[PDB]
Design a protein around this ligand. Sequence first.
Ligand SMILES: [Mg+2]
Ligand SMILES: [Mg+2]
Ligand SMILES: [Mg+2]
Ligand SMILES: [Mg+2]
Ligand SMILES: [Mg+2]
Ligand SMILES: [Mg+2]
Ligand SMILES: [Mg+2]
Ligand SMILES: [Mg+2]
Ligand SMILES: [Mg+2]
Ligand SMILES: [Mg+2]
Ligand SMILES: [Mg+2]
Ligand SMILES: [Mg+2]
Ligand SMILES: [Mg+2]
Ligand SMILES: [Mg+2]
Ligand SMILES: [Mg+2]
Ligand SMILES: [Mg+2]
Ligand SMILES: [Mg+2]
Ligand SMILES: [Mg+2]
Ligand SMILES: [Mg+2]
Ligand SMILES: [Mg+2]
Ligand SMILES: [Mg+2]
Ligand SMILES: [Mg+2]
Ligand SMILES: [Mg+2]
Ligand SMILES: [Mg+2]
Ligand SMILES: [Mg+2]
Ligand SMILES: [Mg+2]
Ligand SMILES: [Mg+2]
Ligand SMILES: [Mg+2]
Ligand SMILES: [Mg+2]
Ligand SMILES: [Mg+2]
Ligand SMILES: [Mg+2]
Lengths: 64, 53, 111, 204
Amino acid sequence: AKKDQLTLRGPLYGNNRSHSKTITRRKWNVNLQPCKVKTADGKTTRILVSTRTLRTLKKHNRLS
Amino acid sequence: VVNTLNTNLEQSTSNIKNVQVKHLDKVSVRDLMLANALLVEKEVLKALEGKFK
Amino acid sequence: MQRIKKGDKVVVITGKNKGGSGIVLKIMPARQQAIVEGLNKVTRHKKKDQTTKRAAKQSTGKVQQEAPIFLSKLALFDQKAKQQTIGKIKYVMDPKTNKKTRVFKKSNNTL
Amino acid sequence: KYTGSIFKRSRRLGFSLLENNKEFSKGKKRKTIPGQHGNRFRSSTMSGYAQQLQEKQRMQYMYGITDKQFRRLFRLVLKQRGNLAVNLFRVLESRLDNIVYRMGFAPTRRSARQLVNHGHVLLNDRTVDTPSIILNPGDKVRLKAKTIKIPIVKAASESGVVSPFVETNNKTFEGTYVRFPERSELPAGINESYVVEWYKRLVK
RNA sequence: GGGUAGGUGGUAAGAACCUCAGAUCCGGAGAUUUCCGAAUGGAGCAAUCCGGUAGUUGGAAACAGCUAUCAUUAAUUGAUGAAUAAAUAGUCAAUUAAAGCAAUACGUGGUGAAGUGAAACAUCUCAGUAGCCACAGGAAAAGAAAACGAAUGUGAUUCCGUGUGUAGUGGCGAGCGAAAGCGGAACAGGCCAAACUUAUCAUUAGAUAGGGGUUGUAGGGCUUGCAAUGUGGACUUGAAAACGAUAGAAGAAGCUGUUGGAAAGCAGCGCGCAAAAGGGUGAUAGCCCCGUAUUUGAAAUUGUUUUCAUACCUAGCGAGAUCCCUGAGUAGCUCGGAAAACGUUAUUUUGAGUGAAUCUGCCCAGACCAUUGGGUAAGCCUAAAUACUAAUUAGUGACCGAUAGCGAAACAGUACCGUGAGGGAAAGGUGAAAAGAACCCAGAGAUGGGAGUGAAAUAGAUUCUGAAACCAUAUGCCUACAACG
RNA sequence: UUGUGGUAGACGAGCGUUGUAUUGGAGUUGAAGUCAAAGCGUGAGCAUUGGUGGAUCCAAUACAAGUGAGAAUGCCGGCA
RNA sequence: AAAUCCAGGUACGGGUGAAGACACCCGUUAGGCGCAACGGGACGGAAAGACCCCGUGAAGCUUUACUGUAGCUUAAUAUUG
Ligand SMILES: [Mg+2]
Ligand SMILES: [Mg+2]
Ligand SMILES: [Mg+2]
Ligand SMILES: [Mg+2]
Ligand SMILES: [Mg+2]
Ligand SMILES: [Mg+2]
Ligand SMILES: [Mg+2]
Ligand SMILES: [Mg+2]
Ligand SMILES: [Mg+2]
Ligand SMILES: [Mg+2]
Ligand SMILES: [Mg+2]
Ligand SMILES: [Mg+2]
Ligand SMILES: [Mg+2]
Ligand SMILES: [Mg+2]
Ligand SMILES: [Mg+2]
Ligand SMILES: [Mg+2]
Ligand SMILES: [Mg+2]
Ligand SMILES: [Mg+2]
Ligand SMILES: [Mg+2]
Ligand SMILES: [Mg+2]
Ligand SMILES: [Mg+2]
Ligand SMILES: [Mg+2]
Ligand SMILES: [Mg+2]
Ligand SMILES: [Mg+2]
Ligand SMILES: [Mg+2]
Ligand SMILES: [Mg+2]
Ligand SMILES: [Mg+2]
Ligand SMILES: [Mg+2]
Ligand SMILES: [Mg+2]
Ligand SMILES: [Mg+2]
Ligand SMILES: [Mg+2]
């Protein structure tokens, strides 16, 4: 599914309000961007993750 | 009409569908006026006077 | 225990037969009946049927048998008493044999 | 919804956020939680009332009461004649199981209450199953005969030990009293009267 | 264990047996439990087909009997091991859990319409309803203030009444509609992270396992003393006791006469009751029977509570130092949405982007600033009051009584309809007792007429009572030159 | 004394059914049901007798309704 | 068997009438009841008229009717040195 693998945060369903306040259901998708990390002997394994976790990954020194 | 709930009187008058015994806080208009006859205890009447106010 | 057993003397207290003495040959507890010999003699209109070795003859005319009687209409018969009378029974337990025995309430006769 | 493999993700970070929230290290605390809660008290500086509050717990616990029942009994006694600091003492000590324990046929107050609820207990103008009826100073409480038919007997002895405001004869299973417990028979475990003024604020 | 003298389930008679060394029957605990079905050795068109492995018995072997085992996923462990040296991927083996179903009912979460109303309709309402899906539990959810809110104020959550159809919110239209406060049901607050310290990891630890800590009238750590050995839990094992649940025992009191087919009705004279609830007995029985009130009883299993001991948690008030710690892609802010009564806005939440501070700190008191006051976010768990009844026991009804009551009083989700999902009926009563009509007559027989049983046969299996429409028979009157609601 | 035609409609007074609560009463020497007859009422309605039928029913005062069938190309059953 | 059927014992002429009568008014004719025929009528039967109109009815289709939207395209921003 279109979801992060580090966390479990997925899509957010909401309304597409326009002029005249017409209601149409729309979907916000999370920023799944490929990322490689070093875990368990630095083993790199491509993992589709949200940009938020990527920023979290960058500051936490893991990403090097 | 009984104020102290005597047990011997309640042991009797229970197989008789005709007669019955009640407390002052249990009798109502219908139970009083269905009686056609009633036996009232002296302290029940005094307790009635207190209740009547 | 049971009010009526197979064998004890019994009489009828209601119906056409009053003071009808007989011996109980068998008791149906489920239907609350009792077959007593000599009372309630009915004569079924016996047909003729021939489909078996015994049915080849099956000689049956006006056979009068026994009709079952409600156990309520029955009453135990006293024998030990000099003046026999109809009464009710108890279920006393004598410690001599620890076995339940029926005893009348208008006398002191066992069974 | 797949091979989540908690090892794969947990080790994947080793600190992050979710691991530490979840950190299997999570112990049991299955006794720390219960016991300390249990029941507390002490006195403080800013509210004063701390002493009053703690005394209520002790007082309520001495008889095994839920706070709601206490509010009912206080409401009843509050309105009557006047300075009733002699009335509510009789009311609090008028419990049947309290009298049964103070009567001396049970090792502990709660055991007496259990007995009462289990139908050991015979009264005068009535009988008794509920261990909460408010009794009148001069009432008798004849004990059943089935209880003596179950000789554990150890009890009768406690009965004679007694305290002066209760008059009960051993073995014969009978009890009554007069001259309701004075404050001496209500020892210094809980002897104060400003919790009383507190209940007027909380209970009208 | 209880309990007896009958039993071999119903349409059901007969034949043949069992049963007083205690049967049948009831209760507790066990044994066996074919195949399909989560189905799980493989398949497959469900109740079928085809096997592997390790044993053991016959055969000379193929083979055939008799056993146990053989699915997948996840976690742990061990062995083996690629591209490619190492190492992983992968492979294998062992152990532990998961699969599914149902209670046409309650809970949480995700998703989520339309008929309709606004007398049209698009905002709105319907409605976060129906439906779809996931996860449970015996309840679930919620929960211990970065709170309400305007005061010398309350002090977790939940539920009920009021506040009120109020303040408000609405193409200000249809409509929607709280939060405080007050009265009640119940009541309970706990625990980690960080400081500081111990031991160990090529100690590059930034990791593992312990002691210390859980906060707001700030708390804790650092150093130094006094007082403490207690009280209490949402708590483990045991022992004992009490109250029950799953079979049961005992349990009072009436005869006579009359109508009647039959008395229990009716009448006379009585009797018992902690029993006059009810059912049956040929009519309408307190005293005929079974029962009921009441007193009692459990070998075995199980529920609640209590006592004792026992693990495991739990403890106050000072002094100095002025040092350290108090939850960050977090709170805020911007761009689109939503939750709250609010149609998006102070408060809550988030899809994209950005992004702080550290008790002289941070958040809040309906834009916002200052003063005042309140509270300590970014960690976790939490009984009770609350929601529901497929089922078990007892019982009730100014509820129904075969077109009613569940669709289904009978063998009803049956017969039947449709490829299928699905749709879906009608039908009860002989008599106290079959004593169900032997026999005779007519007829081929069914059947009918007698006889017989029965109080009744015009109660006869077509079986309680038997209405009308409808079809026939007949006493009496009228009617074949007669225009007729 | 003045009146009494009447649809839509407004108002008032009553009848009838079932059950419940209080009183009393009838019933295998025959209750309900059901059929017939040459009865009583201003109206809903109410009796008497006889046949069939075989066990419940009636009167008064109140109370509560699934309470009153001629029509809906109304439903079911029966019969023309 | 079938559709039909308010109850019928169901004539014609002129007139009348909700405006075209077996049933009303005035006249005329006609013994009771069948059978075989053919269709004049009973505004005959079957189908709550498809034509027309009405309903602030439905559905299908069309477009430069309105409001939106899938898709396509352009820019900013993140992945992005
Ligand atoms: Mg809408
Ligand atoms: Mg046995
Ligand atoms: Mg709409
Ligand atoms: Mg509308
Ligand atoms: Mg919970
Ligand atoms: Mg018995
Ligand atoms: Mg008896
Ligand atoms: Mg009786
Ligand atoms: Mg803010
Ligand atoms: Mg909303
Ligand atoms: Mg502060
Ligand atoms: Mg904080
Ligand atoms: Mg039915
Ligand atoms: Mg019927
Ligand atoms: Mg005959
Ligand atoms: Mg009949
Ligand atoms: Mg003539
Ligand atoms: Mg002529
Ligand atoms: Mg004419
Ligand atoms: Mg004429
Ligand atoms: Mg008039
Ligand atoms: Mg009536
Ligand atoms: Mg009659
Ligand atoms: Mg009706
Ligand atoms: Mg026909
Ligand atoms: Mg004209
Ligand atoms: Mg004409
Ligand atoms: Mg036509
Ligand atoms: Mg039309
Ligand atoms: Mg329109
Ligand atoms: Mg682009």
